[PDB]
Ligand binder design. Sequence first.
Ligand SMILES: Nc1nc2c(ncn2[C@@H]2O[C@H](COP(=O)(O)OP(=O)(O)OP(=O)(O)O)[C@@H](O)[C@H]2O)c(=O)[nH]1
Ligand SMILES: Nc1nc2c(ncn2[C@@H]2O[C@H](COP(=O)(O)OP(=O)(O)OP(=O)(O)O)[C@@H](O)[C@H]2O)c(=O)[nH]1
Lengths: 427, 427, 99, 149
Amino acid sequence: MREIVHLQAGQCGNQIGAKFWEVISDEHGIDPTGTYHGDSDLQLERINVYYNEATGGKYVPRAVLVDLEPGTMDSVRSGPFGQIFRPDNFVFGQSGAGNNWAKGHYTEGAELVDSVLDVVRKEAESCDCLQGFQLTHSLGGGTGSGMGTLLISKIREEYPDRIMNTFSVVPSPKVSDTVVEPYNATLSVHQLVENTDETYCIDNEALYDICFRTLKLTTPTYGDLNHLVSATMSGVTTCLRFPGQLNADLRKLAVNMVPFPRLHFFMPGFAPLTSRGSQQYRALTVPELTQQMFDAKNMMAACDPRHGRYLTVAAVFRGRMSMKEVDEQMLNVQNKNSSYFVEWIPNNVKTAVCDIPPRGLKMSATFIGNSTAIQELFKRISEQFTAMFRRKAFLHWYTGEGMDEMEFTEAESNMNDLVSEYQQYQD
Amino acid sequence: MREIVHLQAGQCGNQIGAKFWEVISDEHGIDPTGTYHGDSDLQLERINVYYNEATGGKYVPRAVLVDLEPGTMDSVRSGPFGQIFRPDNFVFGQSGAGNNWAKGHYTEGAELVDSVLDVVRKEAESCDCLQGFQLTHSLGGGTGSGMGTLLISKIREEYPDRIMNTFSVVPSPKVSDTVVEPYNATLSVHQLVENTDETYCIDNEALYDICFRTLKLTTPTYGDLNHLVSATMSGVTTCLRFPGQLNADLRKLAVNMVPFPRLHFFMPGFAPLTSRGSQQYRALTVPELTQQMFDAKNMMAACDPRHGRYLTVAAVFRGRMSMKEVDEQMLNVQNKNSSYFVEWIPNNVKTAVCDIPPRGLKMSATFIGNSTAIQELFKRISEQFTAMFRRKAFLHWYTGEGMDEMEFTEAESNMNDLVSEYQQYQD
Amino acid sequence: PNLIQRKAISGYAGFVPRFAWVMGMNYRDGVTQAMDDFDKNQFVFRHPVCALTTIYRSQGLIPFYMGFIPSMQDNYALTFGNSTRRAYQKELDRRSHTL
Amino acid sequence: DTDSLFGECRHYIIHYYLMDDTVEIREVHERNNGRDPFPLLMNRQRMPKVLVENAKNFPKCVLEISDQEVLEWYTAKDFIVGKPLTILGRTFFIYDCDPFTRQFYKDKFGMPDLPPVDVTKKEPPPVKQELPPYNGYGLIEDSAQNCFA
Ligand SMILES: Nc1nc2c(ncn2[C@@H]2O[C@H](COP(=O)(O)OP(=O)(O)OP(=O)(O)O)[C@@H](O)[C@H]2O)c(=O)[nH]1
Ligand SMILES: Nc1nc2c(ncn2[C@@H]2O[C@H](COP(=O)(O)OP(=O)(O)OP(=O)(O)O)[C@@H](O)[C@H]2O)c(=O)[nH]1
């Protein structure tokens, strides 16, 4: 059959992966003990997209966690579902990275990449033929980029024929508490834009915004933020796991959404956010679903796409709809703003429709869009890079690590080329 | 279909809308919670004109509550049915109006107009096709006037093919407590006449007069004031939502009502008022219905038309009537005073009958008459403006906003032009 | 009722309750079922002061089916038709966590 | 509110104002409940319990209820812990009082004891993971420490 393998890197990964796997376990109704309490024939049918199976019924995940901080994995094992993780899979190290990209890229990897590659290949021989691997890392997170660049670079030529889903949190345009974060981000994004095929870029500022918009619980927990993002990402995966009239393949999605080799960075979009009164006070229907769905506020990734224009938009739907209403909704929004698409490519919409709704809610969806609303993000990070390489402050750590400034120059050149490339294809 | 969305503004308009909404819900049969008790097929048949539909058998109003003051919105929500309105529409702010129309019209405008436009247009494309909107506010009310100016001035252009009905209560000829009231009122009316089409004018002194006349209960509340005015516009709106033979379109009414564009302001009048013994001491005869209808005591808006002359009179009836009696009663009244109907156009009567009696009494009606009886009102208010503009007292706040006296001058010029042509068309 | 409640006269320029939810079929059956829901919820909130899997059937399944039901591979050496049909009963006994 | 589709249970506070016999309904904005910052539910005012049937001459289309119509208002004599009470199409369960309340009632209205009833909801406990039994290749005491975390 066809299957996927999950990689959990950095403490952003150590966060997400735990929340995400327990979300999917609740979706397929697996108890924390790991023994199925049958409710859904079909989820028994397609639990095999992610979960292998062992004598006694237990449902192992096809994921591997990786980090350098023993305390964090101790905490996640102290979490409710740590028993749904394997001692053999627990690959780790003796040292703390110090959150230095070069430390993660040249020295500490030399005693862990071998083990992690061994793990991934034993799992690959276990499975039949993967559609590919997905990764949860942070592009500015200390250990995440250092480990991830190396492992993705190796696995690329290891398996040149698969789907490398990459998922990263964008550094806040206002708050990081990490001061070498611009340096780490630029260094990482060089190899990222070289190698990857698809990347979702998310930030926490819009998560806080949406918390004060529709969560309306004032002080949130980062775990709840993880709930939201994991909901998004499960949703984008839901195409494979279920029957119904749709087109599951992520490869379908890629050819449907990618106009050129050097476009990878896309911005998630979620479906109804329901709050205190709205549970009694919403008419859950296709029209309002579309309305709130394409709202410049309910998007959560980077920034308002207003200043730019949308290139391609794909919508996954979930529920007992009919395609006529989605067709007319798409036409209506097309005419509403026929100014903010591009005559370059007409009818830039893609639709998938699954009949197996999520639990606790009936009519829902997930959105993905590639627009020209990323120039400002990598712009800001580029000019911060300029301002701080101006005097090469703090450079001593990386120089002693043993990297060189020509790498900085080449990476910034590639980012400048990205800026231009985005600019001309829409302006 | 073809529907309406309501606008309430101003602290009085808050009470107005609260009572009016509770009256509508009462006559349509919706319980305090919102799960309606099925008794009346027709009132189930025609509720999509106002109420929208969500799950759980509830029926939300499409009303948007705008305010600056937390306490007022808190009370009105705390009222008997506040659970029927939506936090979505509970758009508010944190700064007092200062009862300064300049403050309410420029400095506080920009930060609200965006959000209020957002909500109103979301409801707009939620619905199919407006006839228009009724906007209930107070030209004598600071927040109401200030916000109404901007809201109407913007709402004009986007959707200029609809009906922007307005309700406002004229300041008392004897007291206003607010002393900057004349300034606020003229600053509102100058754009009222420029933009809108139909306005219902009312004054509270006549309400107190009628309290002494027939209400007789010696301890009234603004609750009862709202009660009676709500009865009035409920009556004017009764035509749309029921089966029967009559035209219902407010546009039909307007084109029947207004000869020249510059005239927009009209004086309503209501149908039987009753006292404790009369409720069974009274002969429910269409003749005395017409009598007490046309009686000057029964009027409650501005003053006695006995000074002025009528231009257009339209009375809409509700109950188990027939045509011929209202016809011949019109005959009787026209003959009785034919010298007081302008030679300009005879047959200035407009009739229509709905056949569903209100719950509690079978024969009822409502009346609107455009007559040249507002000269007293605007002449007096003009002398007040002039006699407090002689020495520009109480003007430093306005200068601190940054206004200039010219606007006052041209607004007064417009108002006097209205005075002149008002006098000329009938003299 | 009056005239008909099972149907509300085709091309009904008036509206009905229960517009969302069960929908996407022909008209008259929708009318019947929707008004059935409109009196169901009615009495449900009335409730006056109460406080006062064809995928598999008898003979198993067709060859070349995918989707892991529990076991198989752990047990083997039988014709797949049998294997499926015997799993059809031992999914009640030892892997009885299938429902 | 479990009768409705997405309903739940909450808890509120009733203040009987002696000095005017008015009633009120408070609220519990504890935290992170989704609910909007909002003090009240129903304001302090009068409540008509039982009315007459001939308010056709006095329809709700005109002046609301008054002395001429009400059969009886909600007396303080009606509030009793241990039986549901209905208001504005809502029926409530009263469970707890205050020491001052239950001593005021024992003399003024002459009321015996009514203890509060535990209206809370409970759950059983779970159990810790034990040891996969002696594989035969280890040590019956050391393998325990080994196979924990
Ligand atoms: N689980 C969890 N993750 C968080 C929390 N708050 C922030 N994060 C994110 O996790 C990011 C870094 O994750 P990693 O990729 O694991 O970073 P790292 O290379 O392992 O090491 P550092 O970046 O130095 O922490 C931070 O930049 C935060 O944005 C939180 O409260 N809980
Ligand atoms: N609700 C209410 N309003 C009254 C009453 N008597 C007079 N009014 C007037 O109706 C006006 C309309 O209220 P709003 O339009 O909300 O007034 P505002 O914009 O907040 O500014 P102010 O008029 O200075 O209060 C009030 O300002 C009062 O001047 C009354 O008994 N009840």
